[PDB]
RNA sequence: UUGGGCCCGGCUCUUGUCUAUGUUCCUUGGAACAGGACGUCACAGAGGGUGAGAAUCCCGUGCGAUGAGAUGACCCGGGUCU
RNA sequence: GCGAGAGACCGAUAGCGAACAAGUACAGUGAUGGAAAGAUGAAAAGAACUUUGAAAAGAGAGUGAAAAAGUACGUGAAAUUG
RNA sequence: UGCUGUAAAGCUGGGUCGAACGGCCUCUAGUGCAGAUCUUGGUGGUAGUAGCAAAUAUUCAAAUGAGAACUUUGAAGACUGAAGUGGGGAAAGGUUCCAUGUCAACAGCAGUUGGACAUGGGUUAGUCGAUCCUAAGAGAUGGGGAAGCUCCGUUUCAACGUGCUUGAUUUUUCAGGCCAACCAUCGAAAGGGAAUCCGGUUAAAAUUCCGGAACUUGGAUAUGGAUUCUUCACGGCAACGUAACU
RNA sequence: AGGAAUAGUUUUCAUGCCAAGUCGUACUCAUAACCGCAGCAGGUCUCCAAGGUUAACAGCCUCUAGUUGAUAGAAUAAUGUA
RNA sequence: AAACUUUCAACAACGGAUCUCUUGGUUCUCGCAUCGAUGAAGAACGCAGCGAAAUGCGAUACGUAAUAUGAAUUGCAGAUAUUCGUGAAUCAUCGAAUCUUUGAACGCACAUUGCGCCCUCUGGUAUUCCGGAGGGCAUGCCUGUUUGAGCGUCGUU
């Protein structure tokens, strides 16, 4: 009865939603995160796990900021506003 | 929500999910200067918070449905 | 879109701008009762975007105010400040970077590098 | 359950939002690919992930 | 033997703008961008688009020019004030 | 990473896992694992109308250069089948 | 359809098709399949075969419908038999709930029916739970290890109050009066715990809505009563009583 | 520590005034809404509990409630299962 | 002789090989140096007249400003939109803004949209209770300011 009799106890959830990456890997009674190790300051990855990386890395979101980082940069950082020629 | 206007004279809302019953009640007055009895709230399945606003006996609120004008 | 025109509201002053801002809201809230039996209700576009103008001309409006109390001051708000990046906000300024020792600007100044040819 | 947190039925309400069917005047667009809505799901199917 | 500060340039970068010559005749074809006849331009016959293999239809190509913005004690050339 | 130019390279079971709403759908408590899937036509002109059928559909008909191109879409092999 | 070559193969007639391709001299290689319990994809015989046989059981009629063993309604016959095939909940699911429409796919027969598909609707709280308390335990801080990710330690070799209480002050200053064994925090929808009931109401919510009738906490605050000239009440031997009664 | 006589105190007696925010609340709880790949004879915590017989909340019959669900039809060889 | 089985041919099936493509990949070369407490990368949830996804964006939500350009967008709808012009569309460009809940994540906490305190304004007869609006309160370290502590210690009564 170590089969489909014991399955049917699966009603305890050990991970639920995690608040830094929101992938249900927050383990519930160790309160970390397997995935991405909140709480801890550094996020969870490994050399080993190269196909990890590809999964969460610079580019895998919305990079709401560095997006516009070479456009501004290529511009030399202007300050001001553009003038409007005559 | 048009059955709870006429029968109890309760206003039914779309409500800011952020926002709580002394706000809504503050927002109404200020909007269509009327008093609220109560108000109840809710989130629906959607995701959107509803509000059952009872009026005081000074205000019809079918009146105020037309003046609003949603009937 | 269309709607109120950007050069006119930079006309305005703050009271007249609120006043047109609480306008427009009642606008856009009796478009969404309209929009119970309409159902498509194009102009609810043009109201959005005409909100947003007014309340970027309010925002505009503000900050040269408070650009203008801490011109010359020694210290401003910093969302006032330059936003290049963090690495070129720590650098050096050109004057510290340009800062030489009284011993090494006297060599320089005695051999500077010369201007010369050959073949004469 | 019937006793469940904010976090939780937030998350049940984007579930039903992207369960819908694919709206039609989406297939008469110029150069379009999309047939159907290939996200759907059933509850007794597919099971979440809360 | 000799100091320092500004002003315009040059160079670099970004961004905006600009340029030669057939769509002539016949056949096939739904469509000519195919074949044939007659051509033009070529510092341009790379490439692409357009109803089939298009220098010459369109965008471009070659030759260059230019508006605006930036940027540079630590690139140089002139001025100019101490 | 950013911005470009290329190749005696591969050509949808190849080439990156991904030419497509691809790190997507989906699995696993979890760390992780991880696809399949490109092609009507120049143009939807995506078959009006009539008729049989409860309908899907069919038969006339229509569009188209072609329906020996009908979104089960170019070409349409073999196994297998009437 | 044939021709050539011993052959690997080359060429050609007819049909289909629709946009590229070949001969020759050379270069080059991810260059030749019948196998590898090969890989991926596709397809057979098996085969309309095995089988669709637990949980006692169905039948007549009408309605609906193109179509009814299976849907609805009526009549009957039955079963679960309160340790239920009943009525609720915890975990878990997440719209499966309700109404309307509906049969391409799914319900290993069927289907007019459905937990399916499509469109909408639906969950109302001071009193029900959370929130508050602490449990086993988890775990910041001063610190001590460790190259370090981090490990130890929970009041620990620590100068540990974002202290209060008053009289205030309107001088937004103060004057001080008391204390600081223990005291970050998280940790229970079954422990502890302030307080709500009845009748009615919806297609679907109700200790949540309507009607009526209550209650607790926090705050504000006036009147009556109470008490004082024996100032901070009286009575009862007593157990003790009280509308109050520093 | 502060308190009376021409007046003082008290909101632990009665009455009166204001407020109580945030999140959950639909539905299943299982021989079909959970987990066992599934509408799987499995597993999964708990509350209420009528009459007769009886020691009995056992077995058997019944009231309330709920179902009549499990592809069906025709036969009844061998060999099976009970 | 039929049927059946098998073989062959035609047509119709099944299936998607072959051929031809290709906004993709792969590799080489050339050039450049630019993330973040001024809140990054990433996550969650939202946003369109009619949108589920991808893309974009943040309650100013498939966007606001500015510059350039110069008449669209388009599946439908629709201007109280526009055309010899401060003017349609445009991630064309971009120098000004907006930028939810979060996240190194910073009041404390978080399987909770849980629980505080300070400043200014405001509502309810309120410094104290309840509500609202705006602005604040993390840790280590440096320089400086202020307030202190110690017979550690110097001068004097
Ligand atoms: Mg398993
Ligand atoms: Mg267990
Ligand atoms: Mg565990
Ligand atoms: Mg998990
Ligand atoms: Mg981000
Ligand atoms: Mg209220
Ligand atoms: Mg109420
Ligand atoms: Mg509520
Ligand atoms: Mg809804
Ligand atoms: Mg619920
Ligand atoms: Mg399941
Ligand atoms: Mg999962
Ligand atoms: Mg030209
Ligand atoms: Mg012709
Ligand atoms: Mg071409
Ligand atoms: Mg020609
Ligand atoms: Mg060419
Ligand atoms: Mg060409
Ligand atoms: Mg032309
Ligand atoms: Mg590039
Ligand atoms: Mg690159
Ligand atoms: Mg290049
Ligand atoms: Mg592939
Ligand atoms: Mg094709
Ligand atoms: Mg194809
Ligand atoms: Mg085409
Ligand atoms: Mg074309
Ligand atoms: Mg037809
Ligand atoms: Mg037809
Ligand atoms: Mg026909
Ligand atoms: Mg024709
Ligand atoms: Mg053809
Ligand atoms: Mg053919
Ligand atoms: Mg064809
Ligand atoms: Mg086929
Ligand atoms: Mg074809
Ligand atoms: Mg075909
Ligand atoms: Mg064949
Ligand atoms: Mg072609
Ligand atoms: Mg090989
Ligand atoms: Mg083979
Ligand atoms: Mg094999
Ligand atoms: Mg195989
Ligand atoms: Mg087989
Ligand atoms: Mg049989
Ligand atoms: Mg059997
Ligand atoms: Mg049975
Ligand atoms: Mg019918
Ligand atoms: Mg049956
Ligand atoms: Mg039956
Ligand atoms: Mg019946
Ligand atoms: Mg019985
Ligand atoms: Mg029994
Ligand atoms: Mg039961
Ligand atoms: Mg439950
Ligand atoms: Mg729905
Ligand atoms: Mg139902
Ligand atoms: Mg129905
Ligand atoms: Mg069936
Ligand atoms: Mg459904
Ligand atoms: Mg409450
Ligand atoms: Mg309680
Ligand atoms: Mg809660
Ligand atoms: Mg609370
Ligand atoms: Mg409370
Ligand atoms: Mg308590
Ligand atoms: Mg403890
Ligand atoms: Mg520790
Ligand atoms: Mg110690
Ligand atoms: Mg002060
Ligand atoms: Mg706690
Ligand atoms: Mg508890
Ligand atoms: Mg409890
Ligand atoms: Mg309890
Ligand atoms: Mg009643
Ligand atoms: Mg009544
Ligand atoms: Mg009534
Ligand atoms: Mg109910
Ligand atoms: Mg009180
Ligand atoms: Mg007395
Ligand atoms: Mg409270
Ligand atoms: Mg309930
Ligand atoms: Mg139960
Ligand atoms: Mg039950
Ligand atoms: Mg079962
Ligand atoms: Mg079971
Ligand atoms: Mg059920
Ligand atoms: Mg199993
Ligand atoms: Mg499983
Ligand atoms: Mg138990
Ligand atoms: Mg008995
Ligand atoms: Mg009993
Ligand atoms: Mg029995
Ligand atoms: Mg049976
Ligand atoms: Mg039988
Ligand atoms: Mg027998
Ligand atoms: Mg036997
Ligand atoms: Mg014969
Ligand atoms: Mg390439
Ligand atoms: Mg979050
Ligand atoms: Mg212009
Ligand atoms: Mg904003
Ligand atoms: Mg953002
Ligand atoms: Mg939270
Ligand atoms: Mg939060
Ligand atoms: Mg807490
Ligand atoms: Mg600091
Ligand atoms: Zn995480």
């Known amino acids: 009865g170590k089969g489909t009799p014991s399955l049917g106890k699966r009603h305890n959830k050990s991970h639920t939603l995690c608040n830094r990456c929101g992938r249900r890997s927050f383990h519930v009674q160790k309160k970390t995160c397997s995935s991405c190790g909140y709480p801890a300051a550094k996020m969870r990855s490994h050399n080993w796990a190269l196909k990890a990386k590809r999964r969460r890395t610079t580019g895998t979101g919305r990079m709401a900021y560095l997006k516009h980082v070479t456009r501004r940069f290529k511009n030399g950082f202007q300050t001001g506003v553009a003038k409007a020629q005559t | 929500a048009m059955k709870k206007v006429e029968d109890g004279n309760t206003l039914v809302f779309q409500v800011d999910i952020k926002s709580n019953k002394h706000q809504i009640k503050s927002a109404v007055k200020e909007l269509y200067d009327v008093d609220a009895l109560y108000v109840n709230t809710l989130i629906r399945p959607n995701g959107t918070k509803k509000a059952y606003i009872r009026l005081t006996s000074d205000y019809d609120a079918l009146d105020i449905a037309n003046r609003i004008g949603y009937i | 879109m269309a709607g109120v025109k950007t050069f006119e509201l930079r006309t305005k002053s703050k009271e007249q701008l609120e006043s047109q801002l609480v306008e427009l809201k009642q606008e856009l809230a009796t478009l969404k009762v309209q929009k119970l039996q309409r159902p498509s209700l194009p102009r609810i576009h043009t109201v959005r975007k005409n909100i947003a103008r007014v309340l970027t001309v309010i925002n505009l409006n503000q900050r040269e105010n408070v650009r203008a109390f801490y011109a010359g001051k020694k210290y401003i708000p910093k969302d006032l400040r330059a936003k290049k990046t963090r690495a070129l906000r720590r650098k050096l300024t050109k004057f510290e970077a340009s800062q030489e020792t009284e011993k090494a600007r006297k060599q320089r100044i005695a051999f500077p590098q010369r201007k010369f040819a050959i073949k004469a | 359950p019937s006793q469940k947190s904010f976090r939780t039925k937030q998350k049940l309400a984007k579930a039903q939002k992207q369960n819908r069917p694919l709206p039609q005047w989406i297939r ?8 159907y809505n290939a996200k759907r799901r059933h509850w007794r199917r597919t099971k979440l992930g809360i």
């Open chain 4, 28 to 35: 008469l667009r110029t150069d379009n690919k999309i047939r």
